[PDB]
Every structure is written in structure tokens, then in C-alpha cells.
RNA sequence: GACGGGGAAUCAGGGUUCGAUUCCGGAGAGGGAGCCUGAGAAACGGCUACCACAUCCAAGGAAGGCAGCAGGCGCGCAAAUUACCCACUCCCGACCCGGGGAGGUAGUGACGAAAAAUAACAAUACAGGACUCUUUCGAGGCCCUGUAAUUGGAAUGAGUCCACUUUAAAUCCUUUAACGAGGAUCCAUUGGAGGGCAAGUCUGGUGCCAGCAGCCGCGGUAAUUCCAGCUCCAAUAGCGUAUAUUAAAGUUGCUGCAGUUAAAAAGCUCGUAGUUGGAUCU
């Protein structure tokens, strides 16, 4: 009798077929194009899309003009709009079954920083996110798998402690200066 | 089904019970004779004592001789034949040694060309045989 | 021959060689993208059986 | 109490964590029953009882090293394997013979030096009480010349289950509290054999 | 950039000495606690439980 | 190889298996039996007698129940510190004030779950596509795109550590000084490369021997399978093996199987239970 939780669920899912050409082809294509680490995060993005698709199928199973159907139909559509992946004009319940993995991966923090033009490459963007340089509305984020909301898209900039956004120079810069006045004097 | 009536269910249930009891894997898994006759006693691994080293002949298309170990079990007390897994491993073991033994992976059946052998050697003298093969660990003295 | 049933024969009498230079890693960002663009851009699909990436023939 | 001791054993030195320092009362010897006092700090030149958990294999008459550092890799025990290798006196020739059990290590040493002069080989060197494993390792020698398939016990209490199952497959028991009646019983058993 | 915490303002020193946890007053140095462990207290309690009479205070040392 | 249930795994639908296990209820403190007190006990950190086990002894007699918290032995393939505190949540007492291995904290911990390092950025060592020509080689080639240990930087993290913070007191996390990376040796393994099933008719050795192989089958002195080096693919701080189980099993078929010849309808008939019962009433 302890005060614990014991509440945990799996986020990714393992596919049924272990070896196949084409599945590996677009999985490697998505990993290479979006700068992902390995297949676990694309499997968990597939699992989140599977959850949303199952909820949409269950909600469309129920008949029209039921208050529960309208209730979490409006809730799910409002959540998908607030993420920003869904367009405002596509305000319909059966449009949930018409988007794919790259739409969810478009709202990643890594590719949002890469499209903002303050980073050179996608892997350079992932390193720059990973190494505590970008704040999200006066709050630094060091992880790449961050879902940027639509309201927070226009408030992404460098950290004030980072040397890129204005601050103290880095460790190798002062070491280079110390070597410079060591060799000069 | 065939007997299709609304106010009958125990006939279907009793027929399904008898037809499920008249099976092979269900009859093996739900009787005490199969667990009693099992040398492992329902365990994945077991420990035993090495007492003999012998060599059995293989099948007809595959012509070789396999090195296998006679082992007497600790929990039960009856002799089995166990097969050392990898090349150059009979010299790693000697008589009167404790050993860890496990099945091949056919749920208690012979695998390949080796007759009468359904178990294989995993660990001997509380050290892994794979580390003895690959040289990661040195054998106890 | 010595005998038929002496264990570790081909393991014992085989020759011994050493290792080579250390390889690098990019955690599959170009480690598998290199074989992807080898199979896509470099190697053309020839009408036949197959054409593998490790085919040293 | 926050120190790691290393004690040499049969298969080289082993790592032992201290559990407690049982200091016997000064007016009694160390052959006394369970009447001791726990002590936090011990004085110099004292005989106390030291208990560990995973010992199972020790030899008396050897120095032990106390390390103030933190063990991460067995590199400080090389000199220890040198003193446990130099001047080998009680070499454990692990052959296939009689299986012997004793309460103390000195009794086991006395029995093995009796057996090497009695030119009957020995198999196991387990100490303490007798168990199912001891009786069964004695009884697995009923194959391949079963003359050396008997238990030797000097002043060890016998568990009732092992003595009950010994008669099931026919393994006779040597149990005695003194040495020369045990030696004469072994001689009489061999001559009857 | 931002750190949060919980504080309180009393009215006088006597109210702060009246209704406060002892450990925080010890952190301010206004209270001292006994430097006895639970163990030796437990064998002390068992040793006074062993004997009956006035000698309970004598055996407690 | 059964404590029950709330539940867990798998899952199109329909189902199969497990539930000792933190919540609720029931039973017992070696197994039977009996009892005092108390409102409430057949109580066992209460007592009495039996047998089994078992402690001390001057031998006349005394003292026992860890299926509580730690720890030891046995057993087994199989499971952790003889640690600190009543501060947080409650409980008991004559009661702010005392106590609580109930509990909380720390260590062990790759049962399992979540996030997430091992690198980014140029000029040249060079192969070509993108817009226009030289019938064809050549050129502008600025976004180039990719690979090999030439060059100096943009760097931050593990760890070493001052402090601060947390805390009954520390440790864990976060913040912050001074350190801290060029083959950034501050070095990522685990299984495989004939088919299923991603991935070399590469090199050298023994040549139905050694062995590999879940299944087909490879081994006979040309081995696309053995034994070692090079390259390559799979998942990645994780991977392989053995057991019990689920889906695949429309190979237990209620949805939803078969019965001439592949396993299969009693030799035939009567007959009591059970199963199914014509039309017609606004």
C-alpha cells in the first residue's frame, strides 16, 4: 500500500511485416527528409494518427444530431485547428480521414525552425534546438519533438543567454582569446 | 453450426466442450500426464550434473557424428541427453560439472538430424558458454 | 588426420588475421541515405534479375 | 561499516561487503553458542565474528586486504592472486571420488588429508549442513564404479528429508561426532565391500 | 529565468514561536532538537520495559 | 498447477487466456481442540493440552512460534539494505506536546514505460544532373548534390567540481562560477547475408571431417550456407535464445468448418425427456 501511480502506456507500435522494400523506402525517405533520429518517432506519429483515425471512425459510426457526436466532434476539430495542421476552412467532421504523416510532422519544432530561416540545414536545426539556443515565448526548449501551436508560431526566437541572440561569447571563443594573448604575449 | 434453435444453448456448449476436449494441443496443455512426463517439469531452464559424454550418429542424408552430453537432472532425478551448441565446446566442459540446460525450440521435440535429443546446453559452471567460445571470459579453474 | 571425432579441428587449424581502420557513423542520417541515393540516383533499374548495392561482381 | 573487504577464496579473491561486527563477550571463547554483542567500532588485536552474504568459498590462513577506494574493475586484486598462488599447500584436486561434508573448514581439511593417505579420491568440498544437493551429488556416483558413492559427515546434524530419501535409492550414511570411530567404520565398510 | 516559492509573514516573534514546525525554527536557529537516533532510544525503551520498579530510571543510564 | 470480484494482454466483428499482487470482501498465523478478559477474539507480537520440530541446564526443571520490517538457511532457472525519519498522509492514548518498520526518504534495480548524446558548418582533393550552345569532346554551373584522416572556427554536453536550492538532514532534478572535444580514443553494440527474409555467385583454410541449419537443406579437395578478414542490410542503448499465452487458426467454425473417393452417417426401425411447430381474430 504505497502512494504510487503505475500508469503508463506504449507510444510507438511495431509493424507486422519485419522486412519489406517499399515500407522501408518511404520510412527512410521521411526520416532523411525530416531529419529524424530513428524509426521509433515515425512509428509513434503513425500510432497517434491511428488513434485519431479510430476516434473519427467511432464518431462517424454514431448517427447525426446526437449531443455526444457534436460535443467531441467540436472538441476534436477545435483541437486539430489549435494545433494548426488543419486549415480553418475545412471545418467538417469527415475531413479527419484525409491527412497523412507529413502533415503532423510539418508542425514539429525542428522543421518549424528550419522553415523560419534562422538555421542552415535540418540537422543543424536539430542540433541547435538540442543545445539550448531557442526559446518559445521566454521559455527555452531543448527537445526537437515539440508540437508548435498556431498561436505560438510567431514567437520563436533565439535565447537571451545564447551567443547568437546576444549574450556572452561561448567557451571556445574565450579559449581562443586566451590562446591569442598567450601566443601574442 | 448445424443445430440452430433459439431456446437451445447447452447442447451447443456441451458439443463444443467435447470437440475441444477431443483435440491434441488442448489435451496436452490441460492434462497432468504431459506435465508429469516432461523432464523439465514445466520450466524453461533447469540445472543438472554432467556424468557421461557420448556421440550419436546423425540421420540418413546428413552424415556426421554429433557430440552430446548425458545429464542427470537436479529437480527430478532422471537422465537426459543434451547437445552442446557450438563448435569446439566439448573440450570446454568435463565430467562432474553443474550445467544449465534448455530446449531447442520445438516445444519438446527433436530438431534436425539428431535423434533422441531435445535439449541444448546454455550455461556451464555459472559462466556463459558464448563468452567461453568468443574468449570474452576465461574458464574457472 | 589424427582422428575423426576431435573437436575444434577447423577452429584450431585455421589461420589468424587482424582488424582494420575504424569506421564512422551519422546515426543513419546519411548511413542509410547513401544506399538510398545509390539505389535511386546511381544504380539504374536494369531489366533482369536484380542489381544489389553489395554486388562486387 | 562503510568499507569493502576482499577475501581470497577457491576461485581467486571475492568481493565482500561488511554486514556486522559481532564481538563475543570476553569471559567466553569463540566456541560458545548464540550469545554475542553488536559493536560499532572495534579495538586493535581482537577476535570478533564477521559475516557476509555471498561468500560460499573461503580458505583460512590467508591475509585479507581492506580497500578504501571504490571497486570498479578487478585490478587491485592482482597482487592478491599472487599471494594466493604462491606457496600452494592445500591444493584442491577436483577428481571424481567420495563426497565429503564437514561443519568446519579444519574438519574438512583433516578429512581430506586422511583421504589422500587412504588413497581414495574425493569429489566435493562443501561445508555446513547437509542438504538435498549434497545427498544427490553423492548418489549420482551410483553409476561408473559406484564404490565411491557414500556421504562423509563429521558432527553435522542431518536433515530428516535427506535421510528419508537416502533409503529410497540406497545410499548409506557415515555420521559421527568423533574421528577414529568414523575411520574404523570407513575401513570396515571398505573391507566388507 | 523565473523561480517560485512560498513564504509567510507573521505578526510577532511569539506567534512565530507558538504555531510553526520545529524544523523551520531550527533552520532559523531558534530551536534545537535532541541528537539521539531512533535505534538507541528503542533499546532504551525495551530496557526500561525489561525491569519493573524505580530501577527503570537506573537502567536507562 | 481454483481465494472471489473490481480488472490485464490480444483484438474488424464475434471471441481466447490470466487475475498471488497495492481497491473491496473472505481465511489462517505448524495442524487440529478448548478458553479468560473485553461491547467487539475461538485472538495467537493472549492463555491452556497433543504431536512434529526445537533453545538453556548443576538434570530437579525453565523458555518457543518472522505466511510483520531487515537478514540467514533450505528450495529452485527465478526475486534487493541486519539504512535514516515521524517532517509530509493518517491512526491510538488521560491527548497541541507522546508513540507508530502504518507509512515517508535514500541505496540496490537494463521487470517494464517516457524523453533523449555519439555532431554541425566552407574553399579545394572529383562524378553528374538542372537554363542556353559547340553534329559530338568544351563552357557560364551562381541553389549545386554527394564522398576521403588537408587547413582554422561556430559550439555545447557527460565527468571533475565552489556555491545556491531541495530535504527531519542530505543525496536526485534545476540554476550558476572556474575546468572540460578534431582520428572531438569523450571509440555502440546485438544478430545475419541460398529461399521465407533486408542484405557479396568477395578473398583465404579443412575438404560428408569439423560444423551450420526454427523448416527446406548446405558439407564429396570450384562451399552464393562451415571456419577467419573486407563490404553491405536490419533495429539501436539496445539485441538474441528457451518456455506459458494471444492473433495469424474460417486448423474448434455462435457469426463461421467438414462427413461419395483426402480423417468421417450408428446395420435398420420404434420410442420417453430436450429441440422445432401450418393458416385464420381491426
UniProtKB/Swiss-Prot annotation, chain A:
One of its GO terms (molecular function) is structural constituent of ribosome. InterPro entries: Ribosomal_uS4, Ribosomal_uS4_CS, Ribosomal_uS4_euk/arc, Ribosomal_uS4_N, S4_RNA-bd, S4_RNA-bd_sf. One of its GO terms (cellular component) is nucleolus. There is a cross-link at residues 92, 138 (Glycyl lysine isopeptide (Lys-Gly) (interchain with G-Cter in SUMO2)). SMART domains: Ribosomal_S4, S4. The modification N6-acetyllysine is found at residues 65, 115, 154. Pfam families: Ribosomal_S4 (PF00163), S4 (PF01479). GO terms for biological process: ribosomal small subunit biogenesis; translation. It is found in: Cytoplasm; Nucleus, Nucleolus. Residues 161-185 are annotated as: Disordered. The keyword Transcription regulation does not apply. Residues 107-181 form the S4 RNA-binding domain. Keywords: Acetylation, Cytoplasm, Isopeptide bond, Nucleus, Phosphoprotein, Ribonucleoprotein, Ribosomal protein, RNA-binding, rRNA-binding, Ubl conjugation. Belongs to the universal ribosomal protein uS4 family. Component of the small ribosomal subunit. Identified in a IGF2BP1-dependent mRNP granule complex containing untranslated mRNAs. Part of the small subunit (SSU) processome, composed of more than 70 proteins and the RNA chaperone small nucleolar RNA (snoRNA) U3. Component of the small ribosomal subunit. The ribosome is a large ribonucleoprotein complex responsible for the synthesis of proteins in the cell. Part of the small subunit (SSU) processome, first precursor of the small eukaryotic ribosomal subunit. During the assembly of the SSU processome in the nucleolus, many ribosome biogenesis factors, an RNA chaperone and ribosomal proteins associate with the nascent pre-rRNA and work in concert to generate RNA folding, modifications, rearrangements and cleavage as well as targeted degradation of pre-ribosomal RNA by the RNA exosome. This is Small ribosomal subunit protein uS4. The lineage of its organism: Eukaryota, Metazoa, Chordata, Craniata, Vertebrata.
From Swiss-Prot, chain B:
Residues 1-25 are annotated as: Disordered. It comes from the Eukaryota. PROSITE patterns: RIBOSOMAL_S12. It is found in: Cytoplasm, Cytosol; Cytoplasm; Rough endoplasmic reticulum; Nucleus, Nucleolus. The modification N6-acetyllysine is found at residue 134. One of its GO terms (biological process) is translation. Belongs to the universal ribosomal protein uS12 family. This is Small ribosomal subunit protein uS12. It comes from Oryctolagus cuniculus.
Curated annotation (Swiss-Prot), chain C:
The modification N6-succinyllysine is found at residue 49. It comes from the Eukaryota. It is found in: Cytoplasm; Nucleus. Component of the 40S subunit of the ribosome. Component of the 40S subunit of the ribosome. Contributes to the assembly and function of 40S ribosomal subunits. This is Small ribosomal subunit protein eS30. It comes from Oryctolagus cuniculus. The lineage of its organism: Eukaryota, Metazoa, Chordata, Craniata, Vertebrata. The gene is FAU.
Amino acid at each position: 500500500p504505497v502512494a504510487r501511480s503505475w500508469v503508463c502506456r506504449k507510444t510507438y507500435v511495431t509493424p507486422r511485416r519485419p522486412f519489406e522494400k517499399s515500407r522501408l523506402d518511404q520510412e527512410l525517405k521521411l526520416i532523411g527528409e525530416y531529419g529524424l533520429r530513428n524509426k521509433r518517432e515515425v512509428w509513434r506519429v503513425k500510432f497517434t494518427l491511428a488513434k485519431i483515425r479510430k476516434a473519427a471512425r467511432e464518431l462517424l459510426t454514431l448517427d447525426e444530431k446526437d449531443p455526444r457526436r457534436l460535443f467531441e466532434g467540436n472538441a476534436l476539430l477545435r483541437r486539430l485547428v489549435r494545433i494548426g495542421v488543419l486549415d480553418e476552412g475545412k471545418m467538417k467532421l469527415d475531413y479527419i480521414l484525409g491527412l497523412k504523416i507529413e502533415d503532423f510532422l510539418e508542425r514539429r519544432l525542428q522543421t518549424q525552425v528550419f522553415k523560419l530561416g534562422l538555421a542552415k540545414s535540418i540537422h543543424h536545426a536539430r542540433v541547435l534546438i538540442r543545445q539550448r539556443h531557442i526559446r518559445v515565448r521566454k521559455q527555452v526548449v531543448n527537445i526537437p519533438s515539440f508540437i508548435v501551436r498556431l498561436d505560438s508560431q510567431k514567437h520563436i526566437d533565439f535565447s537571451l543567454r545564447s551567443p547568437y541572440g546576444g549574450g556572452r561569447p561561448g567557451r571556445v571563443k574565450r579559449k581562443n582569446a586566451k590562446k591569442g594573448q598567450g601566443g601574442a604575449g | 453450426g448445424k443445430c440452430r434453435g433459439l431456446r437451445t444453448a447447452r447442447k451447443l456448449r456441451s458439443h463444443r466442450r467435447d470437440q475441444k476436449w477431443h483435440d491434441k494441443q488442448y489435451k496436452k496443455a490441460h492434462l497432468g500426464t504431459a506435465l508429469k512426463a516432461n523432464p523439465f517439469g514445466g520450466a524453461s531452464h533447469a540445472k543438472g550434473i554432467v556424468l557421461e559424454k557420448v556421440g550419436v550418429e546423425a540421420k540418413q542424408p546428413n552424415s556426421a557424428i554429433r557430440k552430446c552430453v548425458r545429464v542427470q537432472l537436479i529437480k527430478n532425478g532422471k537422465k537426459i541427453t543434451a547437445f552442446v551448441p557450438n563448435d569446439g565446446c566439448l573440450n570446454f566442459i568435463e565430467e562432474n560439472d553443474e550445467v544449465l540446460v534448455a530446449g531447442f525450440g520445438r516445444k519438446g521435440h527433436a530438431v534436425g538430424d539428431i535423434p533422441g535429443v531435445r535439449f541444448k546446453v546454455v550455461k556451464v559452471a555459472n559462466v556463459s558458454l558464448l563468452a567461453l567460445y568468443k574468449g570474452k571470459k576465461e574458464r574457472p579453474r | 588426420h589424427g582422428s575423426l571425432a576431435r573437436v575444434g579441428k577447423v577452429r584450431g587449424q585455421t589461420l589468424k588475421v587482424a582488424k582494420q581502420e575504424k569506421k564512422k557513423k551519422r546515426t543513419g542520417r546519411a548511413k542509410r541515405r547513401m544506399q538510398y541515393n545509390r539505389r535511386f540516383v546511381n544504380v539504374v533499374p536494369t531489366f533482369g534479375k536484380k542489381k544489389g548495392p553489395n554486388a562486387n561482381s | 561499516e562503510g568499507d569493502t573487504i576482499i577475501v581470497p577464496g577457491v576461485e581467486g579473491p571475492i568481493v565482500t561487503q561488511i554486514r556486522g561486527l559481532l564481538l563475543p563477550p570476553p569471559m567466553k571463547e569463540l566456541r560458545v553458542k548464540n550469545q554475542y554483542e553488536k559493536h560499532k567500532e572495534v579495538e586493535a588485536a581482537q577476535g570478533v565474528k564477521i559475516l557476509g552474504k555471498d561468500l560460499e568459498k573461503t580458505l583460512a590462513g590467508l591475509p585479507l586486504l581492506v580497500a578504501y577506494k571504490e571497486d570498479e574493475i578487478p585490478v587491485l586484486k592482482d597482487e592478491l592472486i599472487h599471494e594466493l598462488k604462491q606457496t600452494l599447500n592445500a591444493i584442491k584436486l577436483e577428481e571424481k571420488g567420495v563426497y565429503v561434508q564437514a561443519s568446519t573448514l579444519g574438519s574438512l581439511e583433516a578429512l581430506l588429508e586422511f583421504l589422500k593417505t587412504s588413497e581414495v579420491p574425493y569429489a566435493g568440498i562443501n561445508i555446513g549442513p547437509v542438504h538435498k544437493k549434497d545427498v544427490m551429488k553423492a548418489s549420482v556416483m551410483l553409476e561408473h564404479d559406484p564404490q565411491y558413492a557414500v556421504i562423509l559427515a563429521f558432527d553435522v546434524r542431518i536433515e530428516r528429508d535427506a535421510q528419508e530419501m537416502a533409503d529410497s535409492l540406497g545410499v548409506r550414511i557415515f555420521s559421527a561426532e568423533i574421528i577414529y570411530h568414523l575411520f574404523d567404520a570407513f575401513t570396515k565398510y571398505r573391507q566388507d565391500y | 529565468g523565473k523561480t517560485t516559492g512560498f513564504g509567510m509573514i507573521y505578526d510577532s516573534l511569539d506567534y512565530a514561536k507558538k504555531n510553526e514546525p520545529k524544523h523551520r525554527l531550527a533552520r532559523h536557529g531558534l530551536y534545537e532538537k535532541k541528537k539521539t537516533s531512533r535505534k538507541q532510544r528503542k533499546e532504551r525503551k525495551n530496557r526500561m520495559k525489561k525491569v519493573r520498579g524505580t530501577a527503570k530510571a537506573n537502567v536507562g543510564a
